[PDB]
From a paper:
The only non-synonymous mutation found was an a443g transition in [name] resulting in replacement of the aspartic acid at position 148 by a glycine ([name]). With reference to previously published structures of the [name] [name], Asp148 was found to be located near the NADH binding pocket. Surprisingly, we found that the Km of [name] ([name]) for NADH was 14-fold greater than for wild-type [name] suggesting a lower affinity for NADH in the [name] mutant. [name] ([name]) could not be inhibited at all by pyridomycin at concentrations below 18.6 µM. To determine the molecular basis for this resistance, we crystallized [name] ([name]) in the presence or absence of NADH. As with [name] and [name] (S94A), we obtained crystals only in presence of NADH and solved the [name] ([name]):NADH structure to 2.54 Å. By comparing the structure of [name] ([name]):NADH with that of wild-type [name]:NADH and [name] (S94A):NADH obtained in this study and elsewhere, we observed only one major effect, namely rotation of the phenylalanine 149 (Phe149) side chain by 90°. Otherwise, the positions of other active site residues as well as the overall structure of the protein were identical. Furthermore, rotation of the Phe149 side chain in the [name] ([name]) mutant also results in opening of a water channel allowing the addition of two water molecules in the active site as well as increasing the distance between the nicotinamide ring of NADH and the ring of Phe149, leading to a decrease in NADH affinity as confirmed by kinetic studies. The same structural changes most probably also explain the decreased sensitivity of [name] ([name]) to pyridomycin compared to wild-type as NADH and pyridomycin share a similar binding pocket.
[name] (also known as FabI) is an essential component of the type II fatty acid synthase system (FasII) involved in fatty acid elongation and is required for mycolate production in [name]. The FasII system is highly conserved in bacteria but absent from humans making it an attractive drug target. [name] is already the target of the current frontline anti-tuberculosis agent isoniazid. The combined results unambiguously indicate that pyridomycin is a competitive inhibitor of the NADH-binding site of [name], NADH-dependent enoyl-[Acyl-Carrier-Protein] reductase, the target of the two anti-tuberculosis pro-drugs isoniazid and ethionamide.
Residue numbers in the entry:
A (entry chain A), B (entry chain A), C (entry chain A), D (entry chain A): 3 to 269
Write the structure that this text describes.
Amino acid sequence: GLLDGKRILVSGIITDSSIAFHIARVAQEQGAQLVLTGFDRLRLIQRITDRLPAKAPLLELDVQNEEHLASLAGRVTEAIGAGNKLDGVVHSIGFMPQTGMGINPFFDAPYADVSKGIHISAYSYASMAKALLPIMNPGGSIVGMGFDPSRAMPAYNWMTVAKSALESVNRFVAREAGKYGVRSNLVAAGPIRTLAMSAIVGGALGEEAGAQIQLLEEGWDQRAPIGWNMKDATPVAKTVCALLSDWLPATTGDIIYADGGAHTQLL
Amino acid sequence: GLLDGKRILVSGIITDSSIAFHIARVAQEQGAQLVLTGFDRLRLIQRITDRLPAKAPLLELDVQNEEHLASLAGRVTEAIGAGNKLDGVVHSIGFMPQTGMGINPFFDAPYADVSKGIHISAYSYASMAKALLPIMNPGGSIVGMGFDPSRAMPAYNWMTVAKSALESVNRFVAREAGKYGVRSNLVAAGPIRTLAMSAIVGGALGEEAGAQIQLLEEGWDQRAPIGWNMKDATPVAKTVCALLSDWLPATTGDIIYADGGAHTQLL
Amino acid sequence: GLLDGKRILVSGIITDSSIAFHIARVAQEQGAQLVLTGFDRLRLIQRITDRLPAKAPLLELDVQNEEHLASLAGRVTEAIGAGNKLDGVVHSIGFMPQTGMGINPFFDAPYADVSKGIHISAYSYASMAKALLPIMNPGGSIVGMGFDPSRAMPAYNWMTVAKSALESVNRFVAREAGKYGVRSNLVAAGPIRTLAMSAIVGGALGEEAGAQIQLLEEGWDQRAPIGWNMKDATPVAKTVCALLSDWLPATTGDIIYADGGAHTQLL
Amino acid sequence: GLLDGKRILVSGIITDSSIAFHIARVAQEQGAQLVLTGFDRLRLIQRITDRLPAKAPLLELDVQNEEHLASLAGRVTEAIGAGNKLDGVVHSIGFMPQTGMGINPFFDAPYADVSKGIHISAYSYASMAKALLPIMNPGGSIVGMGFDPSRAMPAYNWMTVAKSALESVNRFVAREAGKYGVRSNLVAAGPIRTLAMSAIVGGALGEEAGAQIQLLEEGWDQRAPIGWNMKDATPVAKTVCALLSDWLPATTGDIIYADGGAHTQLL
Ligand SMILES: NC(=O)C1=CN([C@@H]2O[C@H](COP(=O)(O)OP(=O)(O)OC[C@H]3O[C@@H](n4cnc5c(N)ncnc54)[C@H](O)[C@@H]3O)[C@@H](O)[C@H]2O)C=CC1
Ligand SMILES: NC(=O)C1=CN([C@@H]2O[C@H](COP(=O)(O)OP(=O)(O)OC[C@H]3O[C@@H](n4cnc5c(N)ncnc54)[C@H](O)[C@@H]3O)[C@@H](O)[C@H]2O)C=CC1
Ligand SMILES: NC(=O)C1=CN([C@@H]2O[C@H](COP(=O)(O)OP(=O)(O)OC[C@H]3O[C@@H](n4cnc5c(N)ncnc54)[C@H](O)[C@@H]3O)[C@@H](O)[C@H]2O)C=CC1
Ligand SMILES: NC(=O)C1=CN([C@@H]2O[C@H](COP(=O)(O)OP(=O)(O)OC[C@H]3O[C@@H](n4cnc5c(N)ncnc54)[C@H](O)[C@@H]3O)[C@@H](O)[C@H]2O)C=CC1
């Protein structure tokens, strides 16, 4: 069991096709005891998570809520029992109001909307770390979910800016986390057919967005020297588990690309 | 005259040691007619700018003000006369509340403070572009001021996150600006002894910040194969002018490092 | 056992402080059956490898020898028995004549000497892949050893050029290897006290080299948010094993930094 | 005149569609006195260069010839007159035997052929610098021609490896050149329809190469936010001249992308 004995907080389960859902599953299959957090439809999330191969306490956490962040460590040690600490934290949380993604022209997202997306998608990586490093073991691992934002791309727009900010935050959380003996890294994932992703290629945010995203994903699989299957989140899940394991013990402030190799190839 | 005939909006003059101040000066020495914008002490800025080798209208612009952004193009064509357009825009604007720079631990900047810095230092690059591309000529150039945020560094903290977001914004403004025949680029500058920079090495934001920044700059000059003189902004000024010229006509969404070569060298 | 059942060719064992030595050891501790290759002192290597926690056939391979490359696949399937294939190949081979490292000024390495180092240290990664992909399983993994060559550094000189070429070769072997269902990646390691490394800080290649390398390594541990211990190769060993495992199944043409996080940090 | 008064050695003119040809032309139009070097058809090159807007001495230089390198500085000061030095050197030289480009599979280039291409296309950048820095002024500029080798691409194959090595060499020549007050940089150009380029899209090196290159170039113009015209070398020429000028005085060991902005954009 890659993750035998480890206690791991996995955030961001919203449906059974969330990337966190699969991380959660592969983690349990691998020996880990989890605690889960969820955003706003908690009953829905409870019903979804009932399907993991094992039970796991579930706590509410709205990353924009000071008080939830304040109480989080208490709620976690309670759920895992006093005298116990986390070995692993997964941040798999993201959001950008739709005015910052694809419908709208890039220049028409208003600041209050982008600030919200940066808050939830980038800054919150620091918040979770701050809230949780006090309850983590030496040898621990924080892992966040990004996508390669180093070139601009159609439709993703401000969400790419948010991911750029996230990569930079991650390099700073690594500085803090290191004082605890704790690694911090991002997994840069290829596009994965989430419920929201599907809704977008179905045109949820306008037709030209839809067509652009669709063209983006097909290009991925073509460049990926080992292919990319957007229908299958589990190679990303496995990658996160590798970073939660003790098998990358000298990597931090870093980015692991689970993307089929697509970013290393031009045509 | 590198810039003969060009009309250029240069933002961000606050003292005679602002980097915009020198860009302004080198630009005039080079043939350009400028319009200047300033933030909040306009009388102060007027008195400062009186010293440039030529007169230049001065307009108020608070990058967080919708109405200033709204009116900006009107105020500019008025100042340069109807039927005239800009060839050049300089964004040399930045700010991060001090809770996000160095005193404070990284995890204690509150979101409202970082959001403010991201607003002024990153998002505003899109705002200026949006406000001004309607009044720019084919062959034009937007240039913003950054610093290399690809590795974390002590004290700069959230300001580095903000610069990471800026680089990503710049790649998107390039997409928009290209429809107008207009380039967008950043100059990544080495550390330069601005009034605020000095105040910080003098300990304005705590002693350990001060010492860290001071150590940062000395490392710069040591790595720079051609040296780096933080007392002298004019090699950065000249670099911005090169991007305003027609001599980099195939570069955009890009980053030019005016940093003595320091980023290309490890020890 | 991370590597249970896998058959793995590990090249480059020359002493018990070679990085391959530890990869070999951690791999065996982890379930793998190995075949080993060695360069020129085969009796010496046999005596060294006798110390691994398990036996492993040992084959001669001089990466500059056409005939050794020609025969290699035969010799390997013989050693592992017909009808069996490799799951894993480790390239941990490197060399640059000393005229290209540190004594000599950079401009005085003669081409014939640099060509030799590029041959052994970069091109040979393609050669091993070519010689061995015919005997590898879907799901396999080729892993080479590099160091981050993206900034120039004192003394390493042409060896850095060679590592730059290696990273680029690796992106091409990924293209080929993918047709076999096989990943190709590099581990970028922090400096590790090998016999040759020690000899150099002891001044083997001149005093100023020695002092520069020594300054390089101390800077590493200072930047590394989780520290770097050049005396201990085993975090690199573990990283290579992670890439040999099935836990990074969507990464290829890529670079994993086992370097304590040092490359993500400026000061 | 951007380059008024400067003396500049421009290498690599072979036809009137060579990139050096246009650099040469734009440089003269801009005030510079040139000395030119040529590889092996000197009479041909003389007849070609007769067309520049001004005369320029022409010297033979085969970058693989020790004796030509040995004598080069003598021949140059002779041609420019004793007591005079160079302000500018252009390296616009490249070659990879066709076994390393596109016909052949990547694994079938033999080392002796790749070594040749690395010799001419990468190592020679150090050679020219070594041969010429002794006859350069403070404030001088060495400029080489590359293409972005950071992702693998079809057909270019070993020539991409060679360009990877070149970028790394350039970071080392910057270290040496800095002791003379001299900058070293590369221009990364978009694809440009040279005679050899045309021959290749015409299938000179096999049909699938041809089709791949052709697909590569069309993708360039599509990503380039300001377009890319492979028929027109003069935006690259202008970029090189910008680096020869005094307008990028703090950039070295660096890479300027004259590529329409294509590398900053994913789809
Ligand atoms: N699906 C894709 O193609 C890729 C997604 N990613 C990233 O993976 C992560 C997970 O998203 P997916 O699983 O793809 O979609 P998802 O929609 O299943 O996950 C988004 C999670 O963010 C949570 N969330 C939103 N606002 C929140 C708040 N205020 N507090 C707490 N949680 C909040 C949602 O509840 C949801 O569980 C995101 O960072 C996404 O950007 C990275 C690469 C690719
Ligand atoms: N000084 C340094 O070592 C380096 C500075 N930079 C960047 O150069 C740019 C200029 O800063 P410096 O000249 O160094 O300092 P400075 O303090 O002279 O310039 C800052 C400018 O931002 C303006 N500003 C702040 N808030 C504003 C708002 N709401 N609206 C409009 N303007 C506002 C200020 O009025 C000031 O003119 C900034 O982007 C800075 O981050 C980049 C590299 C190095
Ligand atoms: N030690 C260090 O600080 C770092 C080393 N690396 C790389 O790790 C790899 C292994 O080197 P170390 O274990 O450090 O030193 P080492 O000297 O123990 O390993 C070098 C291996 O290359 C082999 N070799 C040399 N010429 C050969 C040829 N013609 N054919 C076959 N093999 C040949 C040697 O026999 C030796 O086994 C090299 O790629 C090195 O550049 C990467 C990062 C750091
Ligand atoms: N054409 C393209 O799409 C791009 C070309 N480049 C680079 O621009 C540079 C110039 O090539 P182009 O003008 O495109 O082609 P070209 O064929 O006109 O120039 C090649 C030059 O290399 C010279 N050369 C070859 N072997 C030599 C030797 N032993 N000694 C001295 N010179 C030798 C040739 O004589 C020729 O003048 C090369 O570095 C090329 O890789 C960079 C980006 C794009």
